[PDB]
């Protein structure tokens, strides 16, 4: 530091220079407990709501010679609603036709069945699979469950209203056609509206559209509320499917349950301000806002229990919360500490210079009035909200060294510093420490009977921290004999008589918010000290409350102590006069802190207490009753071996929560003895100015948004774990046919973490959710909380679990998957690896029932866990051991389980594959579920399946199989020739459901597998007697529905509700 520029004055050390210029002038839990992330609930979708697309597979023969090229509508570049092809499948791609604002990083994207879809089934628990084409058939169930959870968490959007036209063309007269935004829209108006295209042809698409109905196209309903504004919601006939229409409909209803109007926000904030801050709401017809913020009390209680389980002890997670509440009380509280009050009132104490004690001057060296009283007093006031977790106690260091003696004047003042500070703590063992400090001051002077030799009189008073250590001479006052212990008898009577009383203040607005507290009734707080309401708004000094009585009676005990015949002749008369004068001076010291704490601080606490990131958590403040002192509080997260009932398995399964906290009794004493007001204040103007700026925040609403995700994620977890392992909650199971492994602890603990990641990514969460639920065993989960008194009387709270629409939709998608398994690339049943050589054109996904067999078929040998193979000596055939002890040659029909082949794959390949190819035997390998891959051959040429089926049979591994190949003939239209084809792997049941339409532009299909466009899907067109809002949900998907499209808007709350300053 060189030189200031007001006067040319040169200095050094710019710590001097800035004062000279002024003279010219004049981890993770800590973050989540204060600034938890905000989930993205509302998301709009301007595209059309579908998830099932129609992909072509093989191209139709457009330049063919049997029928001229002018027949085809491909020769005219006519846009068709369905892709013209020889064979067309339907596959699953979520949001191929969507246009959103915020994507969810979770999607189910499938290749067409000619390609390989094994990377959707090797995703989850396959970390020890060698090949890049194989997957374990014991983890198929967990893979399918994770795919369905991805599938729902993608489709959770809302449908958006965009705009409409009027069709000038005579196609579908007068209809109002939707216009969805994007780079182009010309390719969309054929896909959206199949009934708009003209029908010139006897092609299959034109057989369909000419069979359809005409009046169901475009928009047919709206809610036009105002002139020159948006329509609210419309109903459009367009291409969708019932499953994602159902998912977005139930999600729209779930969000519409949470809705609040601008009036109830005013009615909530006015009661939360308790009249000091007034906000306004408009009185006019408006446009249909969407503000999801109202949740039930059960979700608040569950989210409270999870936060308390986060603040299992740890001693440092909750300390910044108390720091924050102290800083927040700073900006509101009109009470200001004035350390000059004590230095003023201790000046004019009469004393002699010739004495060597100065009682008026020892107490200033005791107090040391300084600046840091505030951040130790307001932490003690903030600790009243958190009786259940934080137990604030006086510091170890604030007590005397050896206990001291009453002849010591400095220890006599050190008792006085503690006697004022101890009523403001929140530990239940405060009065026994207040008694025992004086009983440590008096050893030998006068004695009282104790309990044992361990906790005798001369023990340090800090150690009496539990209700068991409360002495019998304190709990029964008659044992202190007033003959030889009158001062201890008097101090025990003062403690039992003038100790403060608890009370209740009624914070809270349970209409819009939810009362998140348990162990208490809603809309009530509990205080350690009694309170009164403010009558006048010009406050002034008085001496009538419990804190001033407590200041008076300690001083009068000390005056009765210096007025003792056993004690007074040790001191000089001027010193006795000065000590008595200092006590009479210190009785009536003017301080606004007791009247503040009585009648004007609980108003501030009740005003602050809703606007708070960690909502309060209290156990009842019991005054002096040893019977009802809370000794513990405990939360649970799991159960024992058998008991499926939390009310029985709660007491033996809990984690005790709660940590002590230290405070400065000297700073609390200074803050109590020294407090003044502004010189002419009014205690409604002060609050209408101070409380006003902090009521334009949205964190108090966003935490209510967060608790939805916190409560629904644990319900989705306990639903999805119950599929792969046994639990205690009654759920349905639709996916038992898919083969699964036997779940250990690590399988469930892994699967639960993948569910956690799939929630945390999809809802835009960067912090941690449901992690204490992951620390334990996630199979049998429960949530409950209890606290216990001294006598063993326990008060438990078991909150109910409200239903989660995420788990509802996952179970719905499971119910749909039970009938639409063929769309997700899975076949049901099993396969047969016989030899069939014929020129027929039947598809192997729908075999004729001549070829199949079962366990009920006679003459069929069954193989189980036993395989003993005898070799064939001297030309005889080798034999294998039947389940029923027989030895059979390599002929006939066999039945294997898949694991039997997997455990002995190389030994079975060299024995059996030479007989399957050229001999005759059939092997029905049963597995339940398997992914399939397709190969389309031309039926006019030779084909052979051995290079595919041998490549499948070699790659079977004890931990993996690859996908199963098939050979489907290409269905040509016109008359074709005939060629021999050799099929090996056939299916058992029908698996040809994903096939959509064959040849799609020809009049018919003479040779090959055919099907027309499925009428059972397009129900609304083809059935004139069907109502338009009809779905056939568990059986079909229906591919064309009416869908509602909303045009709501979501403003912030400060953009609607304004408060007057």
């Amino acid at each position: 530091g060189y030189q200031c520029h007001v006067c040319s004055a040169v200095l050094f050390s710019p710590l001097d220079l800035d004062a000279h210029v002024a003279s010219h002038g004049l981890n993770r839990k800590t973050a989540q407990l204060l600034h938890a992330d905000t989930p993205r609930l509302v998301t709009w979708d301007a595209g059309l709501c579908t998830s099932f697309k129609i992909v072509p597979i093989v191209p139709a023969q457009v330049p063919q010679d049997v029928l001229a090229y002018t027949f085809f509508t491909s020769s005219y570049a006519i846009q068709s609603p369905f892709p013209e092809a020889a064979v067309s499948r339907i596959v699953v791609h979520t949001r191929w036709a969507s246009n959103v604002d915020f994507d969810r990083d979770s999607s189910v994207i499938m290749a067409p069945p000619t390609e390989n879809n094994i990377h959707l089934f090797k995703q989850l628990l396959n970390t020890e699979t060698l090949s890049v084409r194989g997957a374990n058939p014991l983890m198929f169930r967990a893979n399918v469950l994770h795919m369905l959870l991805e599938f729902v968490l993608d489709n959770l959007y809302l449908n958006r209203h965009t705009g409409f036209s009027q069709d000038h063309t005579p196609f579908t007269e007068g209809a109002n056609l939707r216009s969805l935004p994007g780079p182009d829209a010309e390719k969309w108006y054929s896909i959206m509206y199949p009934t708009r295209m003209g029908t010139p042809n006897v092609s299959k698409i034109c057989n369909f559209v000419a069979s359809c109905v005409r009046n169901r196209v475009g928009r047919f309903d709206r809610a036009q509320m105002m002139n020159g504004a948006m329509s609210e919601w419309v109903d459009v006939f367009e291409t969708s499917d019932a499953l994602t229409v159902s998912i977005r409909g139930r999600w729209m209803a779930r969000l519409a349950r949470m809705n609040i109007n601008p009036t109830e926000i005013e009615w909530a904030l006015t009661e939360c301000a308790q009249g000091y801050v007034t906000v306004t709401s408009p009185y006019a017809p408006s446009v249909n806002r969407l503000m999801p913020y109202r949740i039930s009390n059960a979700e608040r209680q569950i989210s409270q229990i999870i936060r308390v389980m986060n603040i299992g002890n740890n001693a440092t997670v909750i300390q910044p919360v108390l720091q924050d509440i102290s800083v927040l009380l700073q900006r509101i509280s009109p009470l200001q500490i004035d350390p000059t009050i004590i230095s003023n009132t201790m000046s004019t104490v009469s004393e002699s210079t010739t004495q060597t004690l100065s009682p008026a001057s020892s107490i200033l060296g005791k107090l040391r009035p300084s600046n840091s009283d505030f951040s130790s007093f307001r932490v003690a006031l903030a600790g009243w909200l958190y009786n259940g977790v934080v137990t604030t106690v006086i510091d170890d260091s604030s007590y005397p060294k050896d206990g001291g003696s009453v002849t010591s004047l400095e220890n006599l003042w050190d008792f006085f510093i503690l006697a004022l500070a101890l009523p403001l703590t929140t530990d239940p063992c405060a009065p026994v420490k207040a008694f025992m400090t004086l009983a440590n001051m008096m050893v030998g002077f006068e004695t009282i009977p104790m309990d044992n030799q361990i906790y005798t009189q001369s023990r340090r008073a800090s150690a009496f921290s539990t209700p068991h250590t409360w002495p019998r001479c304190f709990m029964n006052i008659q044992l202190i004999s007033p003959i030889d212990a009158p001062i201890l008898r008097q101090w025990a009577e003062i403690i039992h008589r003038y100790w403060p009383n608890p009370s209740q203040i009624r914070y809270g607005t349970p209409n819009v918010f939810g009362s998140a507290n348990l162990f208490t009734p809603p809309e009530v707080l509990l205080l350690p000290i009694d309170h009164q309401p403010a009558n006048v708004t010009t406050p002034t000094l008085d001496f009538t409350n419990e804190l001033t009585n407590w200041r008076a009676r300690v001083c009068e005990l000390m005056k009765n102590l210096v007025d003792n015949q056993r004690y007074q002749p040790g001191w000089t008369q001027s010193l006795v006069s000065s000590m008595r004068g200092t006590l009479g001076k210190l009785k009536l010291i003017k301080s606004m802190t007791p009247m503040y704490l009585q009648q004007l601080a609980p108003v501030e606490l009740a005003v602050i207490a809703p606007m708070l990131p960690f909502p309060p958590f209290q156990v009842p403040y019991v005054r002096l009753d040893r019977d009802r002192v809370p000794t513990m509080v405990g939360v649970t997260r799991q159960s024992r071996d058998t008991i499926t009932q939390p009310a029985l398995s709660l007491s033996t399964t809990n984690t005790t929560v709660g940590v002590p906290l230290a405070l400065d009794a000297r700073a609390i004493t200074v803050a109590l003895l020294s407090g003044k007001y502004p010189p002419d204040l009014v205690t409604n103007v002060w609050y209408a100015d101070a409380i006003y700026p902090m009521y334009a925040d949205t964190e108090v609403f966003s935490n209510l948004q967060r608790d939805v995700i916190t409560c629904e994620a644990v319900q989705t977890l306990v639903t999805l774990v119950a599929q792969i392992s046994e639990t205690q909650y009654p759920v349905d199971r639709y996916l038992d046919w898919i083969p699964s492994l036997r779940a250990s602890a690590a399988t469930a603990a892994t699967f639960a973490e993948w569910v956690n990641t799939s929630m945390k990514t999809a809802f835009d969460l960067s912090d941690m959710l449901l992690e204490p639920l992951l620390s334990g065993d996630p199979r049998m989960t429960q949530l409950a909380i209890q606290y216990q008194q001294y006598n063993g009387r326990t008060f438990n709270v078991i909150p109910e679990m409200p239903g989660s629409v995420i788990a509802d939709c996952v179970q719905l998608t499971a119910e749909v998957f039970n009938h639409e398994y063929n769309l997700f690339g899975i076949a049901r049943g099993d396969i047969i690896i016989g030899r069939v050589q014929s020129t027929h054109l039947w598809s192997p996904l729908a075999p004729p029932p001549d070829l199949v067999f079962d366990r009920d078929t006679p003459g069929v040998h069954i193989f189980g866990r036993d395989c003993r193979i005898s070799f064939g000596m001297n030309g005889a055939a080798p034999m294998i051991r039947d389940e029923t002890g027989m030895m059979v040659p390599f002929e006939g029909n066999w039945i294997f389980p898949l694991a039997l082949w997997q455990m002995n794959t190389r030994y079975f390949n060299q024995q059996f594959d030479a007989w399957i190819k050229t001999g005759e035997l059939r092997i029905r390998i049963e597995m339940g579920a398997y992914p399939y891959m397709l190969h389309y051959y031309d039926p006019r040429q030779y084909a052979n399946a051995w290079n595919l089926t041998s490549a499948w049979l070699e790659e079977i591994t004890p931990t993996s199989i690859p996908s199963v190949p098939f050979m489907v003939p290409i269905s040509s239209d016109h008359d074709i020739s005939s060629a021999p084809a050799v099929q090996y792997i056939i299916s058992t049941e029908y698996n040809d459901r994903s096939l959509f339409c064959t040849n799609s532009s020809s009049p018919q299909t003479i040779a090959g597998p055919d099907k027309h466009i499925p009428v059972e899907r397009y129900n609304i067109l083809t059935n004139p007697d069907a109502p338009p809002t009809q779905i056939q949900l568990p059986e079909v998907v229906d591919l064309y529905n009416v869908v509602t499209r909303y045009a709501y808007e979501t403003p912030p709350i400060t953009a609607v509700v304004m408060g007057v300053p």
């Binding site: 020890e128 060698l130 090949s131 194989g134 070699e954 790659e955 591994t957 004890p958 931990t959």
Partner: protein, 49 residues
């Protein structure tokens, strides 16, 4: 070579190679061909320590 061993053949066999090893001989105290008891001259308890 599609399947790899899940505990690992090269890891299990290298421990079985040293489980296969026979017990170490204890020769001292026993006489040789001439007749002298072989071993060192020591207090027996000091040797066992």
């Amino acid at each position: 070579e599609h399947y790899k061993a899940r505990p690992g053949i090269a890891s299990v066999q290298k421990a079985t190679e040293s489980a296969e090893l026979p017990m170490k001989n204890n020769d001292e105290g026993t006489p040789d061909k001439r007749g002298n008891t072989k071993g060192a001259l020591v207090n027996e308890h000091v040797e066992a320590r």
